[PDB]
From Swiss-Prot, chains A, B, C, D, E, F:
Record-given protein name: Ferritin heavy chain
Residues of the site described as Essential for association with cargo receptor NCOA4: R18
Annotated positions binding Fe cation 2: E58, E103, Q137
GO MF annotations, alphabetized: ferric iron binding; ferrous iron binding; ferroxidase activity; identical protein binding; iron ion binding; iron ion sequestering activity
EC id: 1.16.3.1
Species, as recorded: Homo sapiens (Human)
Amino acid sequence: TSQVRQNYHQDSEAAINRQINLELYASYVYLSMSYYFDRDDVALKNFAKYFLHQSHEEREHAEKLMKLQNQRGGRIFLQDIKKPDCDDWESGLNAMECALHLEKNVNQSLLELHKLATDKNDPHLCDFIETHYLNEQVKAIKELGDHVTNLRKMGAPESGLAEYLFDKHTL
Amino acid sequence: TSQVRQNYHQDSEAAINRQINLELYASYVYLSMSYYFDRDDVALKNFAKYFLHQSHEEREHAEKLMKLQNQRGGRIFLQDIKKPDCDDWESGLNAMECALHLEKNVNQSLLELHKLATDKNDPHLCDFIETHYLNEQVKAIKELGDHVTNLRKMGAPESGLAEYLFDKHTL
Amino acid sequence: TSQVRQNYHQDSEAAINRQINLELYASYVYLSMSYYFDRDDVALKNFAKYFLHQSHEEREHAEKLMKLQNQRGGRIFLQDIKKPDCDDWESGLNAMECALHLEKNVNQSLLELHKLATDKNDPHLCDFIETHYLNEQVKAIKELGDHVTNLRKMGAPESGLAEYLFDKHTL
Amino acid sequence: TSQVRQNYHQDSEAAINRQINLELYASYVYLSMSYYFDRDDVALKNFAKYFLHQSHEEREHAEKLMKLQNQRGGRIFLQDIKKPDCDDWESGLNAMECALHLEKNVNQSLLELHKLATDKNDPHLCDFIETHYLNEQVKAIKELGDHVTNLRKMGAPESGLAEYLFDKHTL
Amino acid sequence: TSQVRQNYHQDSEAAINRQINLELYASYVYLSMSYYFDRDDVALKNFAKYFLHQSHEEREHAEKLMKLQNQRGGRIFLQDIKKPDCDDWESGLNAMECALHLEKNVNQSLLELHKLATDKNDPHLCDFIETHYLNEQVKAIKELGDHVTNLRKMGAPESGLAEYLFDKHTL
Amino acid sequence: TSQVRQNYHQDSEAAINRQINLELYASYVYLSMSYYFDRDDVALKNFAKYFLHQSHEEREHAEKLMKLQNQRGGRIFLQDIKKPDCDDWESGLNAMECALHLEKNVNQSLLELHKLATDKNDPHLCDFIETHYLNEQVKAIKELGDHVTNLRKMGAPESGLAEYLFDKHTL
Ligand SMILES: [Fe+2]
Ligand SMILES: [Fe+2]
Ligand SMILES: [Fe+2]
């Protein structure tokens, strides 16, 4: 080769292609959780609005990594998007716990991308990872921890009143 | 079973689940075409804006079919989303022709869904298909036909001036 | 030295220096309690806002006593600020009870400062203590008593729902 | 362990606890200098306003480091705040020189915190130190150097007219 | 040495002095290209406006590096500014290609400055280079690549209609 | 060659090319003086603002002479820009005196350009020199004379108070 390429290694180009796929998979999981809480025998409408908002945000993360791949002069390659593991998520607390567990895996993958960019001496890429991706993750993990703690103390999951009232007063 | 179900057959419930998957696949194809025209050795920015807009619309079609599945009392089941057939779309006219060919398949599948809903005597579902899906498709097919006709008459694809000027004046 | 000094005894000058230190110590205790309720396994955000507000107010009390020491012609002398007794405050009701117990000690010290100013025949100082410090304390003690009474009646501390709901509706 | 902790070493957790104490000590020194210039036999009111502003800012630095310690999942531990070395600061130029000498020690401690965070491979923490603490220090050191240079050239400290006029025209 | 110097090595001071000269040279080249397109037998007025804009921006970059050298406590030393290599730039496409080739050299020099600042353990300087210089360069290189690609496809340089229409519709 | 040339002699075309170089050299001298007064052991901020303004004006003078060379049908030829004679200007009065001495040389060169244009019978060029360049110079020389006179009477350069107060009240 590209007429704009300068100081961009092949291994970095492949690791960006793996991160794009992982962000699209996260968007698909949040879409599944949103439409579980809209069923007539669950019926919790602010849980549903919250998960549809997280799904719209993961898609923007993936689109911004594609724009970076074109700005540096590499080529995009897409794979299949696997379906999520559960079809039914059982309650509000169990879904908040699965969301926490998924955000920690995404953070672990971003840390190794930063390490590899540091070994090839590529400062523009390190700064991109720090400026746009790496403080957003810690804020998301902190907020999910708070939600799980409150729901356990109110008395869930053996208490329907607890989840009704958390739905009204926090979300 | 559900406490709201009334006059909703098992075969209709399975065909809605297939239509959801097909709309998500169309959204992923348009996303691929958008970021091909943003490369530095193609560089046609209004083609790119047009395909990103079509991609945002297919996702809204799929979400509305999910809301219908929950209103009638059926259960949603998701599958894998396959990747698109091309990685490189070769030109501005070839991408418009592939888009036309994709929209005619989606229209053909909606016609058989309508026929099956007519054979089980389900009027609410027939009216839903007519009111939200069936005139949008014919409008989209007409607009793509116009674009292909103009691009062939201007002199594409063996003429770069032709696609530059169509990009500026029509899109 | 002093060219402004008139009718200001040495013992009053030393007792003002002790009161300055006590107000700074109270500010540091409230700062500790504020950041306990911000931890991820406690997570009660209006308790945290309330204690950070009390901490900002104790610092203004101390600064106003320093301005008085300079207006009368005495000299300020600072000591070390000791650290608070607890690191972990254990619950929402226990922290309100410790706050009540701290405000009664501060009120007891202000009463002896007033008595000593009365024995040296110093009316400007007596009036300063009455106008700015002595009705604020009784208002603070009354409000903390109300909070403790309500929290005990709702069912705390063996009930997480009780503190969740007090956090939302009163604070 | 904490349910949010990921990639946060014990030694970093102890060094953050030392930095919190150092920022609170700096706030206490600036508070002492502010109320020296308010005495009736010094009487320089813009020096006093300037040092009270610096004291309000050091307290915000310390509070932001406490919020970071809770966001990553470590535990805060407080110590005593020592009193400052001087009770009487002697002149307007001598106080600016002591302020410069204190800001260079705070900068030296931030540099070693950055080095230790680099040895444990912790990029979120390095970026926090760079974004919020490390250009503020160089700006503060540059401004104090300018003030000292001007005061020495005007003729201080053996000239009362010099400090009167610097108080009116610069501060 | 200086009373503000802390952790600033001699080799970094010399390398900043070389970068200042390079930015001034780039400003002079863009000024030459601007007034070539204003001649009466070339006469392309939006090419001329575009190159005057780039010339003002390079001068701003050089002035900001001088402010940094004074903030850290080093001393500025200026050299002669050489004249550019061409007097006549021959067409619009050839001038866009020379501009691309110049921006890649400036980017290479910034990368070696970052490497040297990393070897002496100087984090304030690394962060300055990343925050103000490294993403601007990649954006400029991407935009010049797009321009060259479009101009070759329209039919330049053996086509005057092509450059007339690009001047009118893009610049 | 030119199709617009009429009554424009070769010697005038060469003398305009020398004047362009001289105005760019003056712009570079004023840029050096501006960043001397921004050092931390000089620290006089209105002297610095004044010299940066003069530097921005000399560049507009040079650009307007280039536009004239293209309007009459001659060709521009650039040379190297030499560095200024001093690196350190040592005081405020000494820098005002060097600025006065520079403006008288520029005025002397404009007078000989006018004389040569009068010998070849070229009235458009004589009128251009009178309308845009010749009353600006006498205004600049008068203002610098006033500044030098006031600074000598106040007591500079063996008096730092004098330059502090001139910086505040005049500039
Ligand atoms: Fe046209
Ligand atoms: Fe309630
Ligand atoms: Fe004055």
